[PDB]
Amino acid sequence: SSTLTPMHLRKAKLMFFWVRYPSSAVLKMYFPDIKFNKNNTAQLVKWFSNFREFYYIQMEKYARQAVTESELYRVLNLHYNRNNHIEVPQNFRFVVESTLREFFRAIQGGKDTEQSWKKSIYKIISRMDDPVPEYFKSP
């Protein structure tokens, strides 16, 4: 079918633990049950953009906290793994800590008052995607 469902949305969120910047090609490989077209492809792609938005908002918030001075993972896990179906992968943790460090350095260094200060961070994180587990391909 060409219609995205709540199940696809739930699956997409779990996949975020491996891929923050999946290409259309990646998405097609892992969603073999969908007949991709311009509309649903963009719709699926938009979801990961939403996922990243929430992710970075949380990353910056926590980093500012640290500077101004467990819950973070609870927040991330509730959002992307509500029913706690999967174990948070170690590589996601490394990406989270790496992201926090990028924001922490920037904020602590007062670089957050510069234009495009978050771009250098996105670049770094976009290179840290992990291959999506093959089991995600199973119905």
User: Which residue in 27, 45, 20 sits closest to 95, CA to CA?
Assistant: 20
CA torsion sign, 24 to 30 to 31 to 35? positive
DSSP annotation string for the chain: -----HHHHHHHHHHTTT-SS--HHHHHHH-TTS---HHHHHHHHHHHHHHHHHHHHHHHHHHHHHHH--HHHHHHHHHH-TT--SPPPHHHHHHHHHHHHHHHHHHHTTGGGSTTTTHHHHHHHHT---PPPGGGG--
How many domains is the chain partitioned into structurally?
1
Identify the domain containing residue 9 by its residue range.
Answer: 1-139
- Round to whole Å and give the CA distance between 72 and 117: 22
Q: Counting every residue, how long is the chain?
A: 139
- Round to whole Å and give the CA distance between 25 and 57: 27
Domain CATH for 73:
1.10.10.500
Residue 131 Cα to chain centre, angstroms: 13
Q: What residues contact 117, with CB distance under 8 A and at least 6 apart?
A: 106, 111
Q: Quick one: tokens of 74?
A: 């609870």
Q: Quick one: tokens of 127?
A: 């290179």
Query: To what resolution in angstroms was this structure determined?
Result: 2.0
Q: Quick one: tokens of 84?
A: 């706690």
100 close to 59: Cβ distance less than 8 angstroms:
yes
